[PDB]
Each structure stands twice: as C-alpha cells, then as structure tokens.
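Reagents: none. Just compute today. Lysozyme C.
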Amino acid sequence: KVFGRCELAAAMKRHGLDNYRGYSLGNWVCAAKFESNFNTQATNRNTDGSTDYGILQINSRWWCNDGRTPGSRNLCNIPCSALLSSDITASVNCAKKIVSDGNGMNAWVAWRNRCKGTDVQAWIRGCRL
Ligand SMILES: [Cl-]
Ligand SMILES: [Cl-]
Ligand code: NA
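Predicted 3D structure written out:
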C-alpha cells in the first residue's frame, strides 16, 4: 500500500508511535517519507547484502528474518515479509524495539540525514490527528 501522508500519521499515532521514546509524530512520518515514500512494499538491498523492508526500511541484518542475510539476527522475531504488509502493525512494533536500542532514531540513516534538525512538524501539518 502507498499511504497518504496524513493517513500514515493517523496509523502511526493509533499504534502509539507519537512521542514514542521522545520522538514526536512528525519525525516518524518524515522518516517513512524518506525511507520508503510511504510504500509498505518498499525493499532495498544494502551493500552488506542485507535488505531493508517496508515503510520504515527495517534491516534484515538485525531485526527480521529473510533467509538470505548470513550471520544476521531476527530481533523482532518476524519474517521480513511481514514488514511489507498493508497493515503497519509489525513494522511499528519492530521500529519501537529498534529506537529503544540506544541510538534512538539515528538507526534510520534517512532520518539522521534528512529529518534530524529540520522542521519535522511540517510532516503532520494539516492532518486531522
Ligand atoms: Cl538469514
Ligand atoms: Cl533519543
Ligand atoms: Na535476519
């Protein structure tokens, strides 16, 4: 599914991501925008051969299982394929474990280089939340 910007903010909020670990909702929407262009089916191979899946481009080296990333972990205990679903539940629950891991949202390269320190509230501006 390709979410609409406010439609994504709403699902994120309903799923408890707004100010999760101190990150306002706009930070999450901004990250999804640059990681996946709000597309739950987005997949991108990384240099190390691991792959990033879903709206929040969660990586197979540590978080989900895809059967083709040697030496990797599956810390969210789920098939990477479940991160491509129309329903973002699995991706949110997993993003919550990632962001609690110590480096906060800096775990998302796109958030650090394109959202961090920018006007992220702009991403939820105009949305009925
Ligand atoms: Cl694997
Ligand atoms: Cl933090
Ligand atoms: Na894995």
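The helical segments are 5-14, 25-36, 89-100, 109-114.
Action item: order primers for follow-up constructs.
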